[PDB]
Amino acid sequence: AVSVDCSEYPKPACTMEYRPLCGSDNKTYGNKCNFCNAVVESNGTLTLSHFGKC
């Protein structure tokens, strides 16, 4: 329902951004780079739970 604009994805590489994203799958991410990509790889099987670390 909310995953920020992931149109620039997939990316050719992720940055060291330390943005913790708690995917709706009860998982933690390193940043929106791993969230939009994990979203372009799952084909949409990944959602968001709360921009932060769970």
Query: Residues 23, 46: contact at Cβ < 8 Å?
Result: yes
CATH dotted code for 1-54:
3.30.60.30
Reading the block at residue 22, the tokens are: 């708690």
Both tokens of 38, joined, read: 């994990």
Q: How far apart are CA 54 and CA 37, in angstroms?
A: 19
Q: Domain segments of the chain: what residues?
A: 1-54
The shares of helix, strand and coil residues in the chain, as percent rounded to the nearest 5, are: 20, 15, 65
Q: How far is the C-alpha of 49 from the C-alpha of 13, rounded, in Å?
A: 24
What CA–CA distance (Å, rounded) separates 36 from 47? 10
Is residue 14 within 8 Å of residue 37, measured between CB atoms?
yes
Torsion angle, alpha carbons of 38, 47, 2, 12, to 10: 0
